[PDB]
Amino acid sequence: GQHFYWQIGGFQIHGQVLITSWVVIAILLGSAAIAVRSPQTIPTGGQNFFEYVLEFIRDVSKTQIGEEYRPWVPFIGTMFLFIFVSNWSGALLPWKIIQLPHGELAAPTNDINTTVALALLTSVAYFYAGLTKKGLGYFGKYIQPTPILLPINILEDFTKPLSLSFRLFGNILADELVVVVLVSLVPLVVPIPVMFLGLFTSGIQALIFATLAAAYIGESLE
């Protein structure tokens, strides 16, 4: 079904996606505090998982911004970790036995609202960089390469976060509806490798998204 339990507080707001968001952020901060609760030079048991994770984070951050990795290493790690969180959350989430009011709640990225949220964060971070490091008057909006090169860039800058949200939302809702229709057609034995490949793509899409975001970030740096 393409419906959800709309809570109202001034507009109809699907409570299911936000509930999944609260759950994902909750598990995120829980594992983050269990890891960052006991600091160690020789890294602690399981803390080395978070350590190699943040190592890869700052590594790719150095790879795509370079020096100003640490200016946005937190934002990029926030993006990729929360995105892989919602990805594996929709992957592993037994989330249907408690039927909610108008729609079930498994992952919030299934709502493309979340994709629009993160991609607006991407475009706005690009604007903050292209106004802060680059000129506020002459950002990338300044038609540098040709005088005729104004509106192609004007279309492309919009197309960047738009397709960023589009691809991720489609990937999330795609894996969701795939497992849904597969359990609808046949019993539980069939969809297992389908969900396995969906989980393979799940972190992959988050990684590629953070990669392209930091590509645009090294671009606005450039």
Partner: peptide, 27 residues
């Protein structure tokens, strides 16, 4: 469908981003 649930989740994501930044990736 593009409701105001997107701005609500945008608020949720921004608060969680700054919080978890200073919470874990700082510490």
């Amino acid at each position: 469908d593009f409701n105001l649930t997107l701005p609500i989740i945008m608020a949720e994501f921004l608060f969680l981003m700054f919080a978890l930044d200073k919470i874990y990736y700082t510490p």
